[PDB]
Nucleic acid binder design. Structure first.
Length: 14
RNA sequence: GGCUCGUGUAGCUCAUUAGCUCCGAGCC
């Protein structure tokens, strides 16, 4: 179950 | 100052494949 953004416009998956 | 990236023994919610919270570093 990933983490799409990381808050105020960041980018990761898992 | 901005742009991009880090699972960080990091946090939040719903069985998902994304969005929301903060902060650190490099490059231009």
């Amino acid at each position: 179950r990933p983490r799409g953004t990381r808050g105020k416009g960041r980018r990761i998956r898992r």
